[PDB]
Structure formats: C-alpha cells, structure tokens
Ligand SMILES: */C=C\C(=O)NCCCNc1nc(N2CCCC2)nc2cc(OCCN)c(OC)cc12
C-alpha cells in the first residue's frame with residue numbers, strides 16, 4: 404500500500420543540489436501531492452542502551468549536529484541512527500519550521516520506520532524541507 | 538555532599554573563557570582529583586513525549602547540534618533539555634574523545650541528575666572537556 408515504497412529502498416523524485424544562498428539541500432525532481440510518501444529517514448533501528456553506547460563512542464563534536472532520532476513506538480523507546488555518512492537523501496533533507504515534509508511512523512510487521520510525508524503539494528524543483536510531524 | 542552543590546547550583550571552580558583557536562570553553566579555576574564532582578549538565582527534566590513536542594517546536598537547525606540528552610531512568614525514558622541559553626556552565630563544556638570529565642547518573646531523592654565527574658586529575662587552568670561515561674566491567 405505504502406509499505407511497497409519503504410521496502411523498495413528507492414529514493415525517486417529527489418536529487419542533491421546547491422540551494423543558491425543556502426548550501427546543500429535536496430530538491431524535488433517530480434511533483435508530490437499532499438499525503439504522498441517522500442522518503443525514509445534511513446538508519447539503524449536500535450534500543451536506548453545501544454543508542455547510549457553509540458553516542459558515547461562516536462567521535463563527533465555535538466556542535467556539528469546529531470543524526471540520532473529518538474521516538475517511542477508501542478510503549479517502547481527506539482532510536483534511528485543515521486550517523487553513517489551514507490548515500491541516502493533522506494538525511495540530507497534540510498529542516499524548516501514551515502516545511503513541505505512531515506515525519507510519520509510507519510509500521511511493517513511490527514517494525515517502526517521513520518518516513519517523510521508530503522504535508523502539502525510540492526512542485527518539481529522545490530526544495531524538500533522537513534519538520535517534526537509528531 | 539555532591540548533593541548540595543547540585544541543588545544549590547553554585548558552580549564554583551570553573552569560569553567561561555575564550556580559548557585560542559577554539560572559542561568559548563569552560564576553564565578549571567581549581568584542582569579536581571579523579572572522581573570529584575565537576576558540574577551538572579543542568580536542564581529541564583522531561584519525559585520523552587514532551588521531548589518530542591519540544592523538538593518539533595524549536596526553531597533550531599539540527600546542524601548546530603542538540604542540547605537534548607535522552608536516557609532511561611528505572612522504568613521510563615526521560616530527557617535532559619538544556620536548549621535554553623542559561624547562566625549554567627555544564628552545557629558550555631566542550632566535548633572531547635580524550636577529555637577530563639565523564640558523565641554519570643546521580644540520583645537525589647529519586648530524581649535523576651546527569652553530572653560530570655573528573656575522569657583524571659585536573660589542574661587549575663586546564664579546559665574542562667567532557668565525554669559520555671565509559672562502559673567497562675571493571676571496578
Ligand atoms: C548525536 C549525539 C549527540 O549529539 N548527542 C547530544 C546529547 C545532548 N547534547 C549535549 N550534551 C552534553 N552533555 C551530556 C552530558 C554532559 C554534557 N553536552 C553538550 C554540549 C554542547 O556544546 C558545548 C559547547 N560546544 C552541545 O552542543 C549542542 C550539546 C551537548
């Protein structure tokens with residue numbers, strides 16, 4: 404239904420670009436409707452003890468930012484750790500208080516996935532910008 | 538003991554300074570022996586449900602970093618949120634993979650407090666630098 408895109412792992416309709424005056428960002432290359440799946444925030448799904456271990460081990464200054472997103476799913480606390488400098492576009496989508504992408508928890512076979520959903524219609528060539536949807 | 542230093546918020550023994558090449562840091566103005574209490578990482582103590590609402594409402598870009606520290610306490614997941622720019626020095630202590638300060642969970646009347654203890658002897662004049670508590674099965 405929508406699990407198909409998650410399992411796919413494809414990241415279609417977006418590309419990397421220099422936003423002139425902004426620096427790096429992710430750009431829509433196709434039109435999105437409100438409600439459409441945009442992209443997964445891909446990362447290791449881990450419990451909170453492993454998250455504390457990884458956090459303590461990563462050789463990163465906290466001033467450069469954190470890729471570890473905590474959330475609660477079915478009474479349990481999880482972490483999606485995108486620290487690995489992957490080639491996934493989801494973790495390079497920039498933030499904005501008034502974004503065109505909101506976060507959603509999507510469950511497949513009991514496993515939570517952190518995905519971005521279009522919160523409005525988006526034009527080809529627009530910058531994809533996320534907000535914490537809650 | 539450590540506990541009245543914490544509830545008092547008195548943070549003596551350290552001072553803000555600009556370090557050559559680095560910018561703001563916190564400096565030891567007295568000696569600390571290994572194991573001594575240094576400072577609390579002080580913030581609002583909140584449950585994760587409110588951590589997520591706060592995270593969603595802050596107009597902060599993630600590339601300048603996050604003051605929100607998640608941990609588990611007995612049953613629940615809590616968060617220490619030091620986002621607010623306060624008078625408190627714990628949140629300004631820079632990070633290092635080879636620092637002189639370790640985090641630990643210190644409890645006071647059933648409330649978790651995330652504190653920095655000295656991981657080695659610190660001389661006055663040294664910059665305080667923190668790492669997240671090491672995990673070992675040793676004494
Ligand atoms: C992705 C891992 C990560 O960034 N974790 C952030 C955890 C919370 N943020 C900070 N936590 C602390 N302490 C934890 C307990 C002892 C200190 N300290 C800082 C210090 C910071 O800056 C100091 C000045 N450069 C920042 O900057 C955002 C965050 C945290």
Ligand SMILES: */C=C\C(=O)NCCCNc1nc(N2CCCC2)nc2cc(OCCN)c(OC)cc12
Pocket residue numbers: 444467468469470471472473493494495496497498506517519533592599600602603604605
């Ligand atoms: C103190 C709040 C905080 O920093 N929270 C961090 C949450 C995890 N970090 C990031 N999470 C996301 N998403 C969560 C779900 C949708 C997107 N995205 C980013 C993007 C980032 O960079 C964008 C490109 N500059 C960063 O940079 C560290 C972190 C997160």
